C-alpha cells in the first residue's frame, strides 16, 4: 500500500527539483526547515527521528537539499519527511510536512479488534513492518 501521510502523497513521489521548489517556497516565507526519519509508519507515531537540528534562517535552499541527501545516505530503509516550522505568534507550529522518501514496499496495517462492553470494539492499528523486526531492520 501507499502511506498517505504528508501533504503531497496523492501525487507521484517528488523529484529533487520538485522538493527544492517546496523548500524555496517555505524559506521565502521565513520558515525553518528540518528533516526527519522513521521506520514506524503508524498514524500516531508523532515523533520521527530528528536528522540534526532544524536549519534556522539558513538562506540557501541548496543547503537544505544537501542535508536531505546526507540523511538519505545515512538512514536505514524507511520514510523521510521534510517539515517547515513557523515560530510566529499565532502559529508556533509546523506549517508544511511532506514525504521525500518511502520504502519500495510498504505492507501497511491491519485492524486489531478487541470486544469491549456491549457492542463496542477496542481498536488497535498494527503495522506489519514494525511487528516483525526492530528499528533499522523493518524495510
Amino acid at each position: 500500500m501507499r502511506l498517505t501521510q504528508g501533504c503531497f502523497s496523492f501525487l507521484p513521489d517528488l523529484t529533487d527539483a520538485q522538493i527544492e521548489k517546496q523548500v524555496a517556497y517555505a524559506m521565502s516565507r521565513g520558515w525553518a526547515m528540518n528533516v526527519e526519519w522513521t521506520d514506524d509508519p503508524h498514524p500516531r507515531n508523532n515523533y520521527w527521528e530528528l536528522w540534526g537540528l532544524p536549519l534556522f534562517d539558513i538562506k540557501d535552499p541548496a543547503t537544505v537539499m544537501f542535508e536531505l541527501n546526507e540523511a538519505r545516505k545515512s538512514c536505514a530503509a524507511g520514510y523521510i519527511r521534510m517539515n517547515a516550522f513557523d515560530a510566529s505568534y499565532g502559529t508556533e507550529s509546523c506549517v508544511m510536512s511532506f514525504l521525500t522518501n518511502r520504502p519500495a514496499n510498504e505492507p501497511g496495517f491491519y485492524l486489531d479488534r478487541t470486544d469491549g462492553i456491549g457492542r463496542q470494539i477496542i481498536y488497535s492499528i498494527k503495522s506489519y513492518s514494525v511487528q516483525a523486526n526492530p528499528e533499522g531492520s523493518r524495510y
Partner: protein, 468 residues
C-alpha cells in the same frame, strides 16, 4: 429626574465627545429611523434600551452610579449611497456584562432594540470585544494549530464531505459511506445538520458503525481519520450523552448545530476542551437573521461570538458554491476567525480594530455546492487553514464514493503544489490546466472535471460591502 418622558438623547445616551476606553464593548449598528425620527435620537434610543434606560424617567437611577452604566452613542454617520440609513457607534462599559457569558452579552446588545417601533430596520454589523472581556472566555477548545497537530496534517486545506442523502440512511449504510469517503482520501466526513436520531436511524447505530469505518480507513491509509458525529439533541442531558458516547468510543470529533443555542454551545465548548474532542459548529439557522443588509445580525459578529464561545470549526462560506457569499464579506469572516488581531478594513466589513487576546484560532469550513473544478478559486479566496467540504461533490461521482474522494484530493494537492512553485494559479488559464494536467494520470479527476465543468451559482448578493 422629574417624572415623565424625555428624549433618549437628553438622558445621557448620546455623547459626540465620548472618549472610547480600551475596556469598552463597542457595537456598530446600521440604523434605519422611521420617517420623522431624528438619526441621533434613534442611536440614543438603541444605546439606552440596550444599557440602562426605559421609556420614562425613573428615580431609581439615583441609587446607582448612573453615569458609569449608561451606554453612549458616540458617532452617527450616513451610510454611503443609502439615503436615510446611518452607521451608529455605541460604547458600553465593561461592567455591564457578565464574565464569560455570551447569553448575557447578547441579552443586552440584541435583546429588545430590534423590535422598537421608532426604528423601521436595525442591523448589528460589527463589535469591538475588548481584551479584558476576551480573557474571561475560553476561545476554541482545540483551535487550528492543535487540530492540525492531532491530525498530523499541515500546509494544505483539510477535506471533508457531508453524507447524502440528507435523511433516510441507516447507521450501517452511514458507516459504509464514511468508510468509502475516508478510504478514497477525505480527512473527514460528517453527519448532515438534520441527522440527529430518528426512526430510520437511531444515533448509537450511526456512531458505532462510523467508528468501524473510520478505523478501517485509518488502517487502510496510515492517516488519522474521523467523521463529525452529530451530538445535537433536544436537551443538554441528551447532547452530553451523545458527546460522552463519541468520546468513549474514540472519536476525534463531534459536531453541533447553531440551533442548539448559545448556552448549550458554551457548555459543549468547555466539555470539548475537557474531553480532548474537536468541536465542529454547523451554523444552522444563521441566514434567518444574517442574509439581508437592512436588518438582523451580520455573520461576522456571529464569528466573533462563536470564536469566543470556543467552537473549533464554523461554516463560513465558499464564494462560488450554492449559498450566499460575497467574496469581500467572506474574506472578512475568515480573517475574524483566523487572525491574532484585526485592523480596520472597510471593504471586508472590518469596522473596528480588535485584538483577539490570544484566544485560539477557529477553523473556517467552506461547504455547499462546490466541486473540484473550482479548486483554484477556493485556494485563492480561502487560503490554507480551511476545511473544503464536498458532499454531493464526492458522493455524486459516477464511479463511486472512493473515486469522488480521490478526485477532490488529487485536485487539492496538485493545486497547492503548483501554487507553492509560483504558478499564477488563480488565473483562468492556469488553474483549470493544473487540474487537467493532474487529471491525465487520474481517471477519477478526469471524470469529475467532465461531469461538473458547466456548474456555477452566480446570483446577486444581498450581504454586500458599503466601501470599495
Amino acid at each position: 429626574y422629574e417624572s415623565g418622558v424625555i428624549p433618549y438623547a437628553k438622558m445621557g445616551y448620546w455623547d459626540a465627545a465620548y472618549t472610547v476606553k480600551d475596556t469598552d464593548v463597542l457595537a456598530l449598528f446600521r440604523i434605519t429611523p422611521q420617517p420623522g425620527v431624528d438619526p441621533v435620537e434613534a442611536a440614543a434610543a438603541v444605546a439606552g434600551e440596550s444599557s440602562t434606560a426605559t421609556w420614562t424617567v425613573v428615580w431609581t437611577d439615583l441609587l446607582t452610579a448612573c453615569e458609569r452604566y449608561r451606554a453612549k452613542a458616540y458617532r452617527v454617520d450616513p451610510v454611503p449611497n443609502s439615503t436615510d440609513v446611518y452607521f451608529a457607534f455605541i460604547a458600553y462599559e465593561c461592567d455591564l456584562f457578565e464574565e464569560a457569558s455570551l447569553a448575557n452579552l447578547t441579552a443586552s446588545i440584541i435583546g429588545n432594540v430590534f423590535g422598537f417601533k421608532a426604528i423601521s430596520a436595525l442591523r448589528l454589523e460589527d463589535m469591538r470585544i475588548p481584551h479584558s472581556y476576551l480573557x474571561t472566555f475560553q476561545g476554541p477548545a482545540t483551535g487550528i494549530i492543535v487540530e492540525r497537530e492531532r491530525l498530523n496534517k499541515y500546509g494544505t486545506p483539510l477535506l471533508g464531505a457531508t453524507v447524502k442523502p440528507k435523511l433516510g440512511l441507516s447507521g450501517k449504510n452511514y458507516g459504509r459511506v464514511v468508510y468509502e469517503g475516508l478510504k478514497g482520501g477525505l480527512d473527514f466526513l460528517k453527519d448532515d445538520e438534520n441527522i440527529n436520531s430518528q426512526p430510520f436511524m437511531r444515533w448509537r447505530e450511526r456512531f458505532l458503525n462510523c467508528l468501524e469505518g473510520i478505523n478501517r480507513a485509518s488502517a487502510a491509509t496510515g492517516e488519522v481519520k474521523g467523521s463529525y458525529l452529530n451530538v445535537t439533541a433536544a436537551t443538554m442531558e441528551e447532547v452530553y450523552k451523545r458527546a460522552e458516547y463519541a468520546k468513549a468510543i474514540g472519536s476525534i470529533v463531534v459536531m453541533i448545530d447553531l440551533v442548539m443555542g448559545y448556552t448549550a454551545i458554551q457548555s459543549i465548548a468547555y466539555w470539548a476542551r475537557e474531553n480532548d474532542m474537536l468541536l465542529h459548529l454547523h451554523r444552522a439557522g444563521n441566514s434567518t437573521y444574517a442574509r439581508q443588509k437592512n436588518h438582523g445580525i451580520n455573520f461576522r459578529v456571529i464569528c466573533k461570538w462563536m470564536r469566543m464561545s470556543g467552537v473549533d470549526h464554523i461554516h463560513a462560506g465558499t464564494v462560488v458554491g450554492k449559498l450566499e457569499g460575497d467574496p469581500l464579506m467572506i474574506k472578512g469572516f475568515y480573517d475574524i476567525l483566523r487572525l491574532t488581531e484585526l485592523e480596520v478594513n472597510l471593504p471586508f466589513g472590518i469596522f473596528f480594530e480588535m485584538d483577539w487576546a490570544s484566544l485560539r484560532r477557529c477553523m473556517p469550513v467552506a461547504s455547499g455546492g462546490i466541486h473540484c473544478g473550482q479548486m483554484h478559486q477556493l485556494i485563492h479566496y480561502l487560503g490554507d487553514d480551511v476545511v473544503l467540504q464536498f458532499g454531493g461533490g464526492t458522493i455524486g461521482h459516477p464511479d463511486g464514493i472512493q473515486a469522488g474522494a480521490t478526485a477532490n484530493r488529487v485536485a487539492l494537492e496538485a493545486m497547492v503544489l503548483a501554487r507553492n512553485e509560483g504558478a499564477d494559479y488563480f488565473n483562468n488559464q492556469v488553474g483549470p490546466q493544473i487540474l487537467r494536467d493532474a487529471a491525465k494520470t487520474c481517471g477519477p479527476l478526469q471524470t469529475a472535471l467532465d461531469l461538473w465543468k458547466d456548474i456555477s451559482f452566480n446570483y446577486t448578493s444581498t450581504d454586500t460591502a458599503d466601501f470599495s
